[PDB]
Amino acid sequence: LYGRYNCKCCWFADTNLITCNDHYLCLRCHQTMLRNSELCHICWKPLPT
């Protein structure tokens, strides 16, 4: 089972979230961390596509 359906970065966005193989990262945080680099910086795993 995954977490409690939260972004895990901002804690306040739970809407059509995306799984990073460990959590429920949201859309904008995912786009920002993908534009930053290739790592995830919150689970240290390759980011999804």
Partner 1 sequence: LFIRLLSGESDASLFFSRRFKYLLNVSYLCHLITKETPDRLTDQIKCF
Partner 2 sequence: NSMKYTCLNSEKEFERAICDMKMAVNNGDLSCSYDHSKWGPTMSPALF
Element (H, E) at 9: none
User: Counting contacts by CB under 8 A, is residue 15 touching partner 2?
Assistant: no
Structure-block tokens of residue 45: 């795993």
Site mask for Zn ion (CB under 5 A), range 7-46, x = bound? x-xx--x------x-----x--x----------x-xx---
The residues, any chain, with a CB within 8 Å of residue 35's CB and separated by 6 or more, are: none
DSSP annotation of 32 reads: H
Query: Is residue 9 annotated as involved in ligand binding?
Result: no
Q: What residues line the site for partner 2 (CB under 8 A)?
A: 3-4, 6
Q: What residues line the site for partner 1 (CB under 8 A)?
A: 9-12, 29, 32, 41
